[PDB]
Design a protein around this ligand. Sequence first.
Ligand SMILES: CCCCCCCC/C=C/CCCCCCCC(=O)O[C@@H](COC(=O)CCCCCCCCCCCCCCC)COP(=O)([O-])OCC[N+](C)(C)C
Ligand SMILES: CCCCCCCC/C=C/CCCCCCCC(=O)O[C@@H](COC(=O)CCCCCCCCCCCCCCC)COP(=O)([O-])OCC[N+](C)(C)C
Ligand SMILES: CCCCCCCC/C=C/CCCCCCCC(=O)O[C@@H](COC(=O)CCCCCCCCCCCCCCC)COP(=O)([O-])OCC[N+](C)(C)C
Ligand SMILES: CCCCCCCC/C=C/CCCCCCCC(=O)O[C@@H](COC(=O)CCCCCCCCCCCCCCC)COP(=O)([O-])OCC[N+](C)(C)C
Ligand SMILES: CCCCCCCC/C=C\CCCCCCCC(=O)O[C@@H](COC(=O)CCCCCCCCCCCCCCC)COP(=O)([O-])OCC[N+](C)(C)C
Ligand SMILES: CCCCCCCC/C=C\CCCCCCCC(=O)O[C@@H](COC(=O)CCCCCCCCCCCCCCC)COP(=O)([O-])OCC[N+](C)(C)C
Ligand SMILES: C[C@@H]1CC[C@@]2(OC1)O[C@H]1C[C@H]3[C@@H]4CC=C5C[C@@H](OCCC(CO)CO)CC[C@]5(C)[C@H]4CC[C@]3(C)[C@H]1[C@@H]2C
Ligand SMILES: C[C@@H]1CC[C@@]2(OC1)O[C@H]1C[C@H]3[C@@H]4CC=C5C[C@@H](OCCC(CO)CO)CC[C@]5(C)[C@H]4CC[C@]3(C)[C@H]1[C@@H]2C
Lengths: 92, 92
Amino acid sequence: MALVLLSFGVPRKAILYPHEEPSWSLAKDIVFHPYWMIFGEVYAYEIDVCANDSTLPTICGPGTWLTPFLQAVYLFVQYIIMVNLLIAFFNN
Amino acid sequence: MALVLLSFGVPRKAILYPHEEPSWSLAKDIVFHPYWMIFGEVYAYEIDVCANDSTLPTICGPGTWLTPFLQAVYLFVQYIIMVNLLIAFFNN
Ligand SMILES: CCCCCCCC/C=C/CCCCCCCC(=O)O[C@@H](COC(=O)CCCCCCCCCCCCCCC)COP(=O)([O-])OCC[N+](C)(C)C
Ligand SMILES: CCCCCCCC/C=C/CCCCCCCC(=O)O[C@@H](COC(=O)CCCCCCCCCCCCCCC)COP(=O)([O-])OCC[N+](C)(C)C
Ligand SMILES: CCCCCCCC/C=C/CCCCCCCC(=O)O[C@@H](COC(=O)CCCCCCCCCCCCCCC)COP(=O)([O-])OCC[N+](C)(C)C
Ligand SMILES: CCCCCCCC/C=C/CCCCCCCC(=O)O[C@@H](COC(=O)CCCCCCCCCCCCCCC)COP(=O)([O-])OCC[N+](C)(C)C
Ligand SMILES: CCCCCCCC/C=C\CCCCCCCC(=O)O[C@@H](COC(=O)CCCCCCCCCCCCCCC)COP(=O)([O-])OCC[N+](C)(C)C
Ligand SMILES: CCCCCCCC/C=C\CCCCCCCC(=O)O[C@@H](COC(=O)CCCCCCCCCCCCCCC)COP(=O)([O-])OCC[N+](C)(C)C
Ligand SMILES: C[C@@H]1CC[C@@]2(OC1)O[C@H]1C[C@H]3[C@@H]4CC=C5C[C@@H](OCCC(CO)CO)CC[C@]5(C)[C@H]4CC[C@]3(C)[C@H]1[C@@H]2C
Ligand SMILES: C[C@@H]1CC[C@@]2(OC1)O[C@H]1C[C@H]3[C@@H]4CC=C5C[C@@H](OCCC(CO)CO)CC[C@]5(C)[C@H]4CC[C@]3(C)[C@H]1[C@@H]2C
């Protein structure tokens, strides 16, 4: 579950925030939101930053249409596989 | 689950709200948000009160960078251990 997290957080941060200098915030932002997704927070208005209802309209740019695909895959793997494998683990 | 709640709510309220006089609101605020976290509410924009997207920018201060670590631990214990132990309890 922590590998699936960084498999997602590093492409997400890199596609959406390219013009970043080295900063310890990069360590946070690859790990922060993807963890809070495990706990019910979809960040519905930060998906598809190029949308009209977006809360991150300044983040719209080239390649940012990839992030909703990435996150669809992410949560499928987390909840529909890895959370229920863990429910299955405990119950058995 | 109620002990894990107060293990979290009392450090959270104390790190973020230091300049408080005695008040019956302290009884609420150590118990209120941590309970609503069990039920899907991550309070995504009250985590990291020193962030740009914060809804509590006036709460930013010394030591408030500790609260996202505390809450990461909190929900791990609630859902990933204590909710699924309870799913496991009932099913067995
Ligand atoms: C192997 C397993 C197979 C998986 C299943 C198949 C996968 C699903 C496939 C879905 C098809 C793809 C949909 C996008 C189509 C093109 C979008 C486009 O051109 O314009 C849009 C861009 O929007 C984007 O670029 C966002 C991309 C879509 C994200 C989909 C995430 C998956 C969620 C669901 C996953 C579950 C799927 C459930 C299946 C039933 C917007 O239009 P525009 O003119 O560019 O902009 C208008 C301006 N505005 C934005 C300000 C309003
Ligand atoms: C289930 C039923 C679903 C329906 C199926 C029908 C599919 C139809 C396919 C439509 C694709 C073509 C439409 C857009 C044409 C290009 C121009 C455009 O609008 O680009 C948009 C992005 O989107 C793209 O650039 C294209 C996205 C391609 C992938 C779509 C999913 C492939 C099928 C599924 C496979 C998935 C893999 C699954 C893995 C498990 C850019 O628009 P924007 O984002 O608003 O940004 C504009 C602003 N900006 C210039 C500042 C950036
Ligand atoms: C034993 C078990 C091991 C556990 C695993 C390892 C634990 C994970 C470890 C993560 C590493 C720590 C990340 C923070 C790094 C420093 C941040 C910094 O310097 O600046 C940031 C401060 O931000 C903070 O102070 C918030 C602290 C991070 C909260 C992380 C919570 C854990 C969520 C994930 C947990 C799951 C982890 C998943 C693992 C794959 C911001 O930068 P700034 O310049 O200060 O401010 C810029 C201004 N601005 C804010 C207005 C924009
Ligand atoms: C998995 C991969 C993850 C990546 C790993 C890489 C780690 C890199 C480590 C980076 C730490 C150093 C960077 C910051 C330097 C100090 C200055 C600074 O910006 O301070 C910031 C806070 O943050 C801190 O003060 C430091 C946080 C230390 C703990 C980080 C996690 C330790 C590793 C994990 C262990 C966890 C235990 C797990 C338990 C299970 C203050 O910034 P702010 O918050 O925006 O507030 C500013 C405004 N104010 C002045 C009003 C307050
Ligand atoms: C394969 C499933 C079916 C889909 C088939 C059809 C799709 C085939 C694949 C990809 C289609 C790529 C073209 C679509 C973009 C057109 C619109 C556009 O310009 O968008 C963006 C750029 O986008 C790019 O520059 C695209 C980057 C190259 C593609 C990288 C591979 C991604 C998919 C993985 C590989 C594929 C395999 C994945 C396996 C599932 C917008 O940038 P811009 O134009 O500069 O906007 C101006 C910005 N400004 C205003 C802020 C200045
Ligand atoms: C251990 C895991 C790896 C991490 C190792 C590296 C980290 C090692 C540990 C801790 C690092 C502490 C220093 C980081 C803060 C630097 C930036 C700063 O000033 O932040 C804040 C202060 O912060 C403090 O004053 C810190 C308080 C002391 C640390 C208490 C222990 C916490 C961790 C538990 C013990 C550790 C064991 C935990 C086990 C997991 C900001 O306050 P300020 O400066 O006044 O801001 C101005 C505010 N104004 C503008 C509103 C006026
Ligand atoms: C196998 C796993 C693959 C993913 C991963 O773990 C192992 O690989 C690690 C490498 C880390 C980076 C290494 C060096 C720096 C430079 C630093 O520069 C301070 C600049 C300035 C502050 O303003 C000084 O004053 C910023 C942080 C950064 C980019 C690290 C981020 C976290 C990264 C990406 C880690 C990540 C979790
Ligand atoms: C084992 C467990 C450890 C945690 C815990 O349970 C037991 O320990 C309890 C002690 C309680 C406090 C005791 C006294 C007061 C003073 C009062 O002062 C009114 C001031 C003014 C109003 O404006 C009068 O007019 C405000 C409330 C406060 C601080 C209690 C808060 C809840 C606390 C922290 C409880 C908490 C749930």
